[PDB]
Design a protein around this nucleic acid. Structure first.
Ligand code: OGA
Ligand code: FE
Ligand code: ZN
Ligand code: ZN
Ligand code: ZN
Length: 413
DNA sequence: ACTGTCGAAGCT
DNA sequence: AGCTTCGACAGT
């Protein structure tokens, strides 16, 4: 382990890791997942995806989906995406790259967080600028152009910093982990309470469904408690980002800690909260370097064709649409209409773009540090009534000092 | 052989 | 409120 080859050419077989789960064959994965979830059979659905290393993107460089994995029934509880490693016959020949639990949190609590975060971030939220907010040319308008309504990212908790090679709060007497506009401690505590309670609720589910990644993240819980979220023993998270109609361009989260993962809690607008329903718009979570198999979990071609026809796997087609492009790139230190298209991505069967359509209250686990990932731009982004809110829970690298690493930094004298 | 990042404190 | 120090790394 391993001897199937003599070097790991990730650029071809894809990134290799096992802390979400690994096994000799797809059947093995099902055994693991049935045991973890505590449910055999139809509750669990496994989709083979294939690493192609060729990125699906629009003519302007923005995210697109080529296939959508959709919840097949109310009977489906757990979605797993597995990669069969090209040219391997060992005990980690198949690995888990994504876990999605459809019924992640209580719907009543999801409904509430939707209202409360939308209202709170609206009024007091100070947005966090991220590289993945723009395409590579830095001229797209995927978030919308109205500053008041555009899709945005709001980051809370602790973050790693290059200046300190540690927590950004190295020099902070009393850190404000849930900092809002100006200074309004009653709103900030209200936000905190919501996100701490949510951190607390999700950690047990993280442990249950991805033990090894979870255990990696709590190794230093008692050494750096100031850089952890959560209200109870077992605190895998350190940072949390809220994304409101935010189009995250293809990226990896480089600052995240090695051998961890990301948990994403999804909240949707009220028109998209029933199974099978027909929402005006919809945001997808995409893995641009993968394609779907010709075959289902158990090896059948016909079973996989049924899913394509039922819609459990939606095969999308090329599209021409108009989008705006800034006259001048966004820096760091007016616009025109342009025809965007995806024909090229769709022409090549090996250009990727496997997407999932995460539901209200669902929880998605992936190794965002390793896998390229993206979210699709909304037709009409409006963070005042967003089509989708995602709450992304993570822990950065080198967050293992007490007191946000205060002593270690003052020691650098 | 360059670029660019889920920043905040202290002084002015 | 603006101007300054603080600098680890993956990508290309
Ligand atoms: O919102 C999602 O589904 C995924 N989000 C991200 O990758 C991010 O904010 O970095
Ligand atoms: Fe990400
Ligand atoms: Zn874009
Ligand atoms: Zn092998
Ligand atoms: Zn911290």
């Amino acid at each position: 382990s391993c001897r199937c080859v003599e070097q790991i050419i990730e650029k071809d077989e894809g990134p290799f890791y096992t802390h979400l789960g690994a096994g000799p064959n797809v059947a093995a994965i099902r055994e693991i997942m049935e045991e973890r979830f505590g449910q055999k059979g139809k509750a669990i659905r496994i989709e083979r995806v294939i690493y192609t290393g060729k990125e699906g993107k629009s003519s302007q460089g923005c995210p697109i989906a080529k296939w959508v994995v959709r919840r097949s029934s109310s009977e489906e509880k757990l979605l797993c995406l597995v990669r069969e490693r090209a040219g391997h016959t060992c005990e980690a020949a198949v690995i888990v790259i994504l876990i999605l639990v459809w019924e992640g949190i209580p719907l009543s609590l999801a409904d509430k967080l939707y209202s409360e975060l939308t209202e709170t971030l609206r009024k007091y939220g100070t947005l966090t600028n991220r590289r993945c907010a723009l395409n590579e040319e830095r001229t797209c308008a995927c978030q919308g152009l109205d500053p008041e309504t555009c899709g945005a990212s709001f980051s809370f908790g602790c973050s790693w910093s290059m200046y300190y090679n540690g927590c950004k709060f190295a020099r902070s007497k009393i850190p404000r982990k849930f900092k809002l506009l100006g200074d309004d401690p009653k709103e900030e505590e209200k936000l905190e309470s919501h996100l701490q309670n949510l951190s607390t609720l999700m950690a047990p589910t993280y442990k249950k469904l991805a033990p090894d990644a979870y255990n990696n993240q709590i190794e230093y819980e008692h050494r750096a408690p100031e850089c952890r979220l959560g209200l109870k023993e077992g605190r895998p998270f350190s940072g949390v980002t809220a994304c409101l109609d935010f189009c995250a361009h293809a990226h990896r989260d480089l600052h995240n800690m090695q051998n961890g993962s990301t948990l994403v809690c999804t909240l949707t607008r009220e028109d998209n909260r029933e199974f099978g329903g027909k929402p005006e718009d919809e945001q997808l979570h995409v893995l641009p370097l993968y394609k779907v198999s010709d075959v289902d979990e158990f090896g059948s071609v016909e079973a996989q064709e049924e899913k394509k026809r039922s819609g459990a796997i939606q095969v999308l087609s090329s599209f021409r649409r108009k989008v705006r492009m800034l006259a001048e790139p966004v820096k760091t230190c007016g616009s025109d209409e342009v025809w965007s298209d995806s024909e090229q991505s769709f022409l090549d069967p090996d250009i990727g773009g496997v997407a999932v359509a995460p539901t209200h209250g669902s929880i998605l686990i992936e190794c965002a540090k390793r896998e390229l990932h993206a979210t699709t731009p909304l037709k009409n982004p409006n963070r005042n009534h967003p089509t989708r809110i995602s709450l992304v829970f993570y822990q950065h690298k080198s967050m293992n000092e007490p007191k946000h690493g205060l002593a270690l930094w003052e020691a650098k004298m």
